[PDB]
């Protein structure tokens, strides 16, 4: 069972594996003294062991780059959220039993929800 395996793996100190250049960007110790990475090398490769505290440190302390391109390449996903935001809902009708994408919310076992997408 992978679920319990990862439950146990996350309890260790450095369950993540990263490259060697990480040592040049983020420091070995937090502002409180917590360790972020260790000198030990991975078996079979030159990777190093890293802790999730390194991930959080990078997210809150690290280089910034413009992400203008992201919406362009992931256009299909953003179109969905736009349509959902600009849609209009309606009353629920309990009766015997662009639209298919939201099929899990419109139809049901014995009820119908009125929906017209905002696009």
């Amino acid at each position: 069972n992978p679920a319990l395996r990862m439950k146990w793996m996350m309890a260790m100190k450095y369950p993540i594996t990263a490259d060697k250049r990480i040592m040049e960007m983020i420091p070995e110790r937090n502002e409180q003294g917590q360790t972020l990475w260790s000198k030990t090398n991975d078996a079979g490769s030159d990777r190093v062991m890293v802790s999730p505290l390194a991930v959080t440190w990078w997210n809150r302390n690290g280089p910034t780059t413009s992400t203008v391109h992201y919406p362009k390449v992931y256009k299909t996903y953003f179109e969905k959220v736009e349509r959902l935001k600009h849609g209009t809902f309606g009353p629920v009708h309990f009766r015997n039993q662009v639209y298919i994408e939201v099929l899990h919310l419109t139809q049901g076992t014995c009820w119908e929800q009125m929906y017209t997408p905002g696009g």
């Binding site: 100190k13 110790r29 502002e31 409180q32 003294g33 917590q34 360790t35």
Partner: protein
Amino acid sequence: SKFLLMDALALSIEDPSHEGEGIPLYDAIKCMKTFFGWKEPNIIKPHEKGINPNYLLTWKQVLAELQDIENEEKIPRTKNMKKTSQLKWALGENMAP
């Protein structure tokens, strides 16, 4: 004076389990776990006649040693600092003629 009197500030906790005499290191750690405003220390008012980076390294060392408590098979009752160079200078080791 040995300790500050008017400028003293304390980190406070509440222990309802009234222990007659318990280990103080655990109390210190618990009081330090209620603060989430640590930042990078820096020197603003230096000691004129002393090596200040030694003091800064000493503070960083105690901070690191306290965290090194977690990765132990058994938690200790007392912490023993490592005889490092900055502690050698600050505590006046090897100064008697």
